[PDB]
C-alpha cells in the first residue's frame with residue numbers, strides 16, 4: 001500500500017536529510033559560517049542520499065497530491081532526471097575528499113556541488 | 128536551525144524509505160507475496176537508510192511536537208538506541224547477501240532483520 005501522503009513524506013524527507021547535511025557546507029563556502037568540523041561525513045551522507053533519491057520518484061508517485069515535481073521527470077526527461085542524481089553522488093564523493101584536503105579545496109568543490117541542486121530544481125521543481 | 132515540521136518530515140521520511148524497501152521482502156518471508164526480483168537492491172538500500180538514520184534524532188530534535196520517540200532515545204539510553212541503527216545496518220547488509228543466495232536464505236535472514244525493527248520499536252517508540 002503506502003498512502004500517497006506517506007509517499008510524499010518519504011520524498012520530501014529524503015530532500016530534507018539532504019538539506020540538513022548540505023547547509024553547513026554551503027554557508028562556510030558562502031563566507032556566512034565557520035567550517036563544519038564534520039564536513040567529510042556530511043558529504044558522504046549527501047552521496048548516500050543521492051543513491052537512494054530515485055526511490056522518492058518511483059512508479060506510481062507521478063502525481064502525488066501537493067507534489068512539486070514536473071511530470072517530465074517521470075516521462076520524456078526521465079533519463080536526464082536520473083542523471084542529475086548520479087551527478088550529485090559523484091560531486092558529493094569529490095566533496096568528501098576535498099573536505100579532508102582542507103578548507104580551500106572544500107570551498108572550491110562546494111561551488112561545483114551546489115550547481116547540481118540548482119540545475120535540477122530549475123528544470124524539474126515546480127515551486 | 129530548521130522548523131520542527133521539516134525536522135520531523137526528515138525523521139519520518141527516512142522511516143518511510145526504510146518501510147518501502149522492507150515491505151515486499153517481509154511480505155515474501157511471510158508467504159503473502161512473491162519473491163521480489165530486486166530483493167538484493169532493497170536490502171542494500173535499507174543498509175544505507177540505517178547509516179543515515181541517526182541524523183533524524185540529532186541534538187535539537189529531542190522534543191519535536193508530533194514526535195513519537197521516547198525521551199530515553201536522546202539521553203539515558205542514547206547508546207542503546209544508536210546501537211540498534213548499527214545492528215539494522217549489519218543485518219540489512221547480511222540480508223543483501225542472503226537475497227543473492229536464494230529464497231530460503233532470504234526468508235531466514237529476513238526473520239533476523241525484522242527483529243531489530245521490533246526491539247527498537249518496543250523500547251523507544253510511542254504508541
Ligand code: HEC
Pocket residue numbers: 011012013015016018019022046066067068069070081082083084085088113114116117118120121124125126136
Ligand atoms: C534532481 C536530480 C535534484 C537534485 C540533484 C536536487 N534536488 Fe532538491 N528537489 C528535487 C525536486 C524535483 C524537488 C521537488 C519534490 C516534490 O515535492 O515533488 C526537490 C525538493 C527539494 C527540497 C524540498 C523538500 C520539501 O520539504 O519539500 C529541498 C530542501 C531540496 N530539494 C534540496 C536539495 C539540495 C540541497 C540539493 C543539492 C545538494 C538538491 N535538492 C539536489 C530534485 C532535485
Ligand code: HEC
Pocket residue numbers: 138139140142143145146149173193194195196197200208209210211212215240241243244245247248251252253
Ligand atoms: C531504532 C534503533 C529503530 C529501528 C532499528 C527501526 N525503527 Fe522504526 N522507528 C523508530 C522510532 C523511534 C520511530 C518513531 C519516530 C518519531 O519520533 O516519529 C520509528 C518510526 C517508524 C515508522 C513510522 C514513520 C512515520 O511515518 O511516522 C515506520 C514505518 C518505521 N519506523 C519502520 C521501521 C522498519 C520497517 C524498521 C526495520 C527494517 C525500523 N523501523 C527499524 C526507531 C527504529
